[PDB]
């Protein structure tokens, strides 16, 4: 099925040619364009006064790169290295040791926030859901030294809030 465009002919009737002549010599369609633009003038513009009104979102945003921990407990990661294996720019870096207990843990857990391209593959991949793409997007950093997060940075960034993260996960653990 094909519906082509631009196949008319100029009708040589007096009415059609004097309408096209009025269009030419009387600037009518240009006035029509001005009418359309003023019709959008007298509306109310959909702006938001920014630092008071933040924008809308979804409960599945990808932001801050926080870590979680067990209820009234210790860390949730294991250093199972799946997130370093699936990080598509390989920004994850994990060096792992066990501590004085015997349970396996880490030493060093690094995200390059430069090389992080915010897929969510480490959100889908982590079996204990230890790393979560955080909720907020306000990084705005002066130097290049700060943008290389450490494990203690991610723990203090997960300790800065979990109530947000827990509410969003309980909203959306059923889909993914």
């Amino acid at each position: 099925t094909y519906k082509y465009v631009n196949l008319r002919e100029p009708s040589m009737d007096m009415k059609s040619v004097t309408d096209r002549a009025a269009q030419t010599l009387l600037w009518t369609e240009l006035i029509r364009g001005l009418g359309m633009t003023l019709s959008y003038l007298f509306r109310e513009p959909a702006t938001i006064n920014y630092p008071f009104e933040k924008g809308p979102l979804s409960p599945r945003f990808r932001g801050e790169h926080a870590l979680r921990r067990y209820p009234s407990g210790e860390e949730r990661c294991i250093a199972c290295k799946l997130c370093e294996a699936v990080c598509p720019a390989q920004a994850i870096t994990i060096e792992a040791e066990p501590r004085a207990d015997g349970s396996r843990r880490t030493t060093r857990y690094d995200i390059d926030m430069t090389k992080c391209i915010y897929c969510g593959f480490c959100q889908e991949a982590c079996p204990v859901d230890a790393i979560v793409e955080g909720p907020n997007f306000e990084f705005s950093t002066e130097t290049h030294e700060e943008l290389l997060y450490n494990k203690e940075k991610l723990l203090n960034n997960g300790d800065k809030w979990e109530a947000e993260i827990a509410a969003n996960i309980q909203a959306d653990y059923l889909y993914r």
Binding site: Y70, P71, E74, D101, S103, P127, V128, D159, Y173
Partner: protein, 95 residues
């Protein structure tokens, strides 16, 4: 549980704190070292030793699909408590 180092810098949960021959001290000049304040080692003694009377029990982690996968741990040692590898919290049996 920070350690009174001669440098005075805060130690971490991992024993990585510096010496007097380290210039990474002088790159910490004027920029306060953010260390974790709530550790991970001592938060096991804060949790009581649970007592479940059966022999071989099941651990999930506080709710379905939020936590670690099902791990079926054994309690056959007479003097050593059980320990889930994922959780970290112990279990004992009640005869």
């Amino acid at each position: 549980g920070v350690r009174t180092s001669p440098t005075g810098e805060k130690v971490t949960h991992t024993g990585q704190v510096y010496d007097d021959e380290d210039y990474r001290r002088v790159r910490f000049v004027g920029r306060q070292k953010e260390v974790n304040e709530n550790f991970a080692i001592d938060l096991i003694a804060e949790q009581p030793v649970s007592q479940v009377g059966s022999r071989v029990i099941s651990c999930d982690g506080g709710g379905g699909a939020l936590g670690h996968p099902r791990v079926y741990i054994n309690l056959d040692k007479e003097t050593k408590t059980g320990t889930c590898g994922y959780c970290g919290l112990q279990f004992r049996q009640q005869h």
